[PDB]
Design an enzyme around this catalytic site. Structure first.
Site, PDB file in Angstrom:
ATOM      1  N   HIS A 186     -42.207 120.344   6.279  1.00  0.00           N
ATOM      2  CA  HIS A 186     -41.990 119.203   5.396  1.00  0.00           C
ATOM      3  C   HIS A 186     -43.273 118.415   5.177  1.00  0.00           C
ATOM      4  O   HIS A 186     -43.418 117.738   4.155  1.00  0.00           O
ATOM      5  CB  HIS A 186     -40.900 118.300   5.976  1.00  0.00           C
ATOM      6  N   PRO A 566     -32.216  96.613   0.913  1.00  0.00           N
ATOM      7  CA  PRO A 566     -31.005  97.434   0.830  1.00  0.00           C
ATOM      8  C   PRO A 566     -30.991  98.223  -0.469  1.00  0.00           C
ATOM      9  O   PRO A 566     -31.630  97.857  -1.461  1.00  0.00           O
ATOM     10  CB  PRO A 566     -29.862  96.409   0.875  1.00  0.00           C
ATOM     11  N   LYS A 567     -30.235  99.321  -0.452  1.00  0.00           N
ATOM     12  CA  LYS A 567     -30.266 100.283  -1.549  1.00  0.00           C
ATOM     13  C   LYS A 567     -30.062  99.612  -2.907  1.00  0.00           C
ATOM     14  O   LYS A 567     -30.807  99.871  -3.858  1.00  0.00           O
ATOM     15  CB  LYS A 567     -29.204 101.357  -1.310  1.00  0.00           C
ATOM     16  N   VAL A 571     -32.913  99.269  -6.065  1.00  0.00           N
ATOM     17  CA  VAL A 571     -32.771  99.774  -7.425  1.00  0.00           C
ATOM     18  C   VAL A 571     -32.820  98.628  -8.427  1.00  0.00           C
ATOM     19  O   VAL A 571     -33.453  98.736  -9.484  1.00  0.00           O
ATOM     20  CB  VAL A 571     -31.469 100.588  -7.555  1.00  0.00           C
ATOM     21  N   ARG A 572     -32.165  97.509  -8.106  1.00  0.00           N
ATOM     22  CA  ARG A 572     -32.077  96.398  -9.045  1.00  0.00           C
ATOM     23  C   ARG A 572     -33.441  95.765  -9.294  1.00  0.00           C
ATOM     24  O   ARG A 572     -33.781  95.439 -10.440  1.00  0.00           O
ATOM     25  CB  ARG A 572     -31.078  95.358  -8.532  1.00  0.00           C
ATOM     26  N   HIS A 589     -38.803 111.168  -5.345  1.00  0.00           N
ATOM     27  CA  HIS A 589     -37.667 112.012  -5.700  1.00  0.00           C
ATOM     28  C   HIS A 589     -36.438 111.154  -5.946  1.00  0.00           C
ATOM     29  O   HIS A 589     -36.061 110.942  -7.103  1.00  0.00           O
ATOM     30  CB  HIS A 589     -37.452 113.072  -4.619  1.00  0.00           C
ATOM     31  N   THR A 590     -35.818 110.601  -4.899  1.00  0.00           N
ATOM     32  CA  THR A 590     -34.786 109.593  -5.122  1.00  0.00           C
ATOM     33  C   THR A 590     -35.353 108.381  -5.858  1.00  0.00           C
ATOM     34  O   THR A 590     -34.732 107.871  -6.797  1.00  0.00           O
ATOM     35  CB  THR A 590     -34.159 109.167  -3.797  1.00  0.00           C
TER      36      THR A 590
END
Ligand SMILES: O=C(O)CCCOc1ccccc1[C@@H](NS(=O)(=O)c1ccc2[nH]c(=O)ccc2c1)C(=O)N(CC(=O)O)Cc1cccs1
Lengths: 697, 13
Positions: A186, A566-567, A571-572, A589-590
């Site tokens: 990896h 936090p996720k 994103v926001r 990637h994500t």
């Protein structure tokens, strides 16, 4: 005669070095027949048993060795390695510290201790212990290469050029001498190794799994050759340790339930216990069958279970990542086994037939980088659940605090309903964007942010401070639930300038190298007021990045770091950037999916490894070819144009905003249908008696 | 993922 037992033990050590583990076990055991109180033989035997996955038996023999010889430092250090593999971190630490107490000059023990610090997040202590190891044993490939990764993690680029030279030299020497390379597969994508070396690294880590299944002496499985027993349905099994709160579920959690039950029977094999999150709940409920293999630790019994379900296509979602049990694939319980989504690289292993990818990510001219045959998805192999997880980001409004689309942002499911109550909102053509004037309601919202309040209520609507989501609804913060309130996100929350261009990158800092930061510096120098927005992962890397940037001519105030969020907040808050600068060494990637779902254009330069080409695959599916650079010059020019031609920026941002919906990139229903067509091509090929071949259509 | 470790092989003398 003493030479008898000694000779057996030392010959076994040689066999062990050569890879003849079975013969080594035999000789160790014969040594113990000749000399039962042979501490060294007990510990050496335990070491090969550990390598064969017989961990409890190894511990028993380590303890025997120490019973015989209480100051046997080798046995304590070796026992630590076994406890570490069993997830007993405290036990491992107590063994290593005992070994170093017995023998402070014991280099291996210092290096093994360092590996605990590295995995615990204590990179400074890991670096110190690896350096002690290399001081005691200057020729120590494991310690050097793991030290090199520590330095990568914190962006210490001291003598980086010499470091890369030695890393490649070490790998070359180990591959030539038929040894397990000290560079993890990896991690190999991060270093200037040839594609042959990277594939060979993977092959040799995959071979570790063979040592663990060979001791099971299981015969080959008989595989189905038709769909009669399954009523015409193709039986697909997804194997993952990451059915839970893990990026992999954030990408594909919708896919098991979207398979067509008339043609497919979906089996999800979890390698992890139930972490209690909605992600695990969803897959368990929507899959046709869900099997918790964490309850079946024996890989022979676990593979038997897979085979008893009649799987036609078994999908490996871990590769060489934490939680993998590739021993399951090494046993070949299914006739067709494919890599998918979770690991950005080849297994290098004979027991994987296909890697599911696409023509952009893995063009046919580079098929030699993979041991698997290529199986192409029609657009991109990447997918994300953002349309399901973060629908509150489908629309947005702004406050005209003077008009910007990314200085003060509101999102919410009930956002339109809220704006209906405001008889003075302005709609701006750019879908279009509502703009709240600097009225009474807007002043209260801005006061909430400035005062640090958690949330307020206006016209019955809850308006939430975007920094406080975990205090309002922890399930919304993680992405397990869609936020219910209207959320406020501002540049002031992250210390970003109101009047300047923000370039962002939210990747792990180990994906940055000197070449990448030089390119970013070149961009900032051409856009006068611009800043770079980076992630504290880890925080101790910040002063190194600042140092090297200032060394390249960038004042410290040009680079702004934020903590891991936090996720949902992560994103926001991507909406606050103007442009995302992707890492060429190893793309997001994500995080590439996250930034595009926020509507932020991402600039990328695809390389040659799979990991370096994912972002361009995503942008091609999205339909923004103008964000894909062919060289560093174009990469810089694209980013500078976006940052200096504000009408072009508006056009590009509008394109991403719209095409994240209209393109296939986030369309999980379309993805599953195309995935199913690819599975059938695989099956019909096998059913016709053919060995795996490139499914490039 | 878990960082790999180094096993020590003991020579009999
Ligand atoms: O590269 C890839 O595609 C995945 C790599 C492995 O990720 C793993 C693995 C195991 C468990 C958790 C994770 C990450 N989950 S997540 O991707 O969905 C996530 C979640 C919140 C986040 N908040 C931020 O502010 C910035 C990023 C971010 C990312 C995660 O949480 N990370 C942060 C942390 O562990 O504290 C790792 C990061 C990935 C990218 C930048 S950091």
């Amino acid at each position: 005669c003493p030479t008898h037992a000694d000779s057996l033990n030392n010959l076994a050590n040689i066999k062990r070095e050569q890879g003849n583990i079975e013969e080594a076990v035999r000789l160790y055991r014969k040594a113990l027949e000749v000399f039962p109180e042979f501490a060294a033989a007990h510990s050496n035997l335990a070491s090969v048993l550990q390598q064969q996955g017989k961990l409890q038996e190894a511990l028993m023999h380590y303890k025997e060795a120490i019973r015989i010889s209480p100051t046997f430092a080798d046995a304590y250090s070796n026992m630590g390695n076994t406890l570490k593999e069993m997830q007993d971190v405290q036990g491992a630490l107590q063994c290593y510290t005992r070994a170093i107490q017995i023998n402070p000059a014991f280099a291996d023990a210092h290096s093994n201790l360092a590996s605990i610090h590295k995995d615990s997040g204590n990179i400074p202590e890991a670096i110190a212990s690896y350096r002690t190891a290399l001081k005691l044993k200057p020729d120590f490939p494991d310690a050097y290469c793991n030290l090199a990764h520590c330095l990568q993690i914190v962006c210490d680029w001291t003598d980086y050029d010499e470091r890369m030279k030695k890393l490649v030299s070490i790998v070359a020497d180990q591959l030539e001498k038929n040894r397990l390379p000290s560079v993890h597969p990896h991690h190999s994508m991060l270093y200037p190794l040839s594609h042959g070396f990277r594939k060979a690294i993977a092959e040799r880590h995959g071979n570790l799994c063979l040592d663990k299944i060979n001791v099971l002496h299981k015969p080959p499985y008989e595989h189905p050759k038709d769909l009669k027993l399954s009523d015409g349905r193709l039986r697909v099994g997804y194997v993952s340790s990451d059915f839970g709160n893990h990026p992999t579920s954030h990408l594909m959690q919708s896919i098991p339930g979207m398979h067509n039950p008339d043609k497919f029977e979906v089996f999800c094999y979890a390698l992890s216990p139930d972490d209690g999150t909605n992600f695990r709940v969803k897959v368990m409920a929507e899959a046709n069958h869900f099997i918790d293999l964490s309850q079946i630790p024996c890989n022979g019994k676990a593979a038997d279970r897979i085979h008893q379900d009649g799987i036609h296509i078994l999908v490996n979602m871990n590769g060489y990542t934490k939680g993998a049990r590739n021993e399951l694939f090494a046993l070949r319980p299914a006739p067709i086994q494919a890599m998918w989504l979770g690991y950005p690289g080849t297994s290098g292993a004979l027991f994987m037939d296909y890697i599911i990818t696409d023509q952009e990510t893995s063009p046919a001219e580079v098929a030699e980088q993979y041991s698997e045959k290529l199986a192409y998805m029609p657009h991109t192999f990447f997918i994300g659940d953002h349309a399901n997880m973060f629908p509150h980001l489908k629309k947005k409004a702004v406050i005209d605090f003077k008009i910007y689309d990314n200085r003060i942002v509101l999102n919410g499911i009930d956002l339109k309903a809220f704006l209906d109550s405001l008889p003075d909102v302005k709609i701006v053509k750019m879908l279009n964007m509502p703009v709240i004037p600097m009225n009474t309601i807007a002043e209260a919202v801005i006061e909430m942010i400035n005062r640090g309040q958690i949330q307020i209520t206006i016209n019955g609507f809850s308006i939430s401070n975007g920094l406080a989501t975990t205090q309002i609804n922890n399930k919304a913060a993680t992405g397990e639930e869609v936020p219910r309130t209207i959320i406020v996100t501002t540049r002031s929350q992250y210390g970003l300038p109101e009047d300047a261009i923000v370039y962002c990158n939210f990747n792990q800092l180990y994906k940055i190298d000197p070449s990448t930061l030089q390119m970013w510096a070149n961009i900032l120098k051409r856009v006068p007021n611009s800043v770079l927005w980076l992630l504290r992962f880890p925080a101790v890397g910040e002063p190194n990045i600042q140092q090297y940037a200032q060394n390249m001519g960038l004042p410290q105030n040009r680079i702004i770091f934020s903590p891991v969020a936090p996720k949902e907040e992560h994103v926001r808050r991507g909406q606050l950037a103007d442009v995302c600068l992707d890492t060429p060494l190893c793309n997001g990637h994500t995080t590439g999916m996250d930034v595009l779902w926020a509507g932020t254009p991402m600039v990328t330069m695809p390389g040659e490894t799979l990991a370096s080409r994912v972002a361009a695959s995503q942008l091609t599916c999205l339909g923004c070819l103008e964000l894909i650079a062919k060289n560093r010059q174009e990469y810089e020019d694209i980013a500078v144009k976006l940052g200096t031609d504000l009408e072009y920026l508006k056009k590009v941002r509008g394109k991403v905003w719209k095409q994240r919906i209209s393109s296939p990139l986030f369309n999980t229903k379309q993805y599953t249908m195309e995935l199913e067509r690819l599975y059938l091509q695989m099956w019909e090929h096998y059913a016709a008696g053919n060995k795996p071949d490139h499914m490039i259509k | 993922h878990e960082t790999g470790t180094t096993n020590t092989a003991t020579t009999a003398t």
